[PDB]
Amino acid sequence: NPELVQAVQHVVIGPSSLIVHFNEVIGRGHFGCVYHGTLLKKIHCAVKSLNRITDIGEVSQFLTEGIIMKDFSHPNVLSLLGICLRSEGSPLVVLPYMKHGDLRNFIRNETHNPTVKDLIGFGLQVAKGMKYLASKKFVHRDLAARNCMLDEKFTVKVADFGLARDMYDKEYYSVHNKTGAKLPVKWMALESLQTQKFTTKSDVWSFGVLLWELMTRGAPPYPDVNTFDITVYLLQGRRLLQPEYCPDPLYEVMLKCWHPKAEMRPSFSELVSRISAIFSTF
């Protein structure tokens, strides 16, 4: 498609400008692995392979869906460095290197031992990136602690969307839902599990879950709820319990994020205010 081609060409990177270390895997997704690469004056970057997508139609659909990523610019949103097209193989997606990897592995690491304040700060950052994406009317559909990255300045990048989209930890995606496709059902809003529709308000639901992951330092949500039972569990009005070290007012925020009525849930702009106030009392 010539239109998709014009868009891609805005961000194309010539094969000569990119060195990829295929012996240095730093990420594993369903569409391909992530590698240490260098972009040219050498910039250290992360190179996401799409090679597992071999069908040209599907490659076209993925590029079509994710290309808008080049139009986003915000300190808490992961940016696109470019796309490297070559003579043999699927396009390589080139992204900025994130020195501290994904937020979930970061807060789970026991030498790190992040404080309550550090954790609420991380959540404030995500709230702000999500606030920007919502203002662009972009719906994420897979927000979770595993899907936010941390750069060398400990700035949190909302990630795993657009051209970087993939399943980077397979254990938390299940076919036990109405679509039959692999979905993150334990981060999904109740109405999304029922109607298969995703909105910014269902993103807010996910953000609530991510907040919970933060305060538990990366505990898996509903460890005792089988993927078969997640929908009925939420229908009965049950929710994630308050983490031991979560401040009461922040747990109140989580609960609002999981209000059964989508319209009744806060906006990300409101969440930035409330969490910013909570963070400041630390």
Ligand SMILES: Fc1ccc(-c2cnc3nnc(Cc4ccc5ncccc5c4)n3n2)cc1
């Ligand atoms: F163990 C895990 C858990 C999660 C991820 C994950 C989540 N969302 C993402 N969005 N884009 C990327 C690629 C991407 C971009 C820059 C990176 N920088 C350093 C290391 C890996 C990277 C991967 N990711 N990656 C990777 C490894």
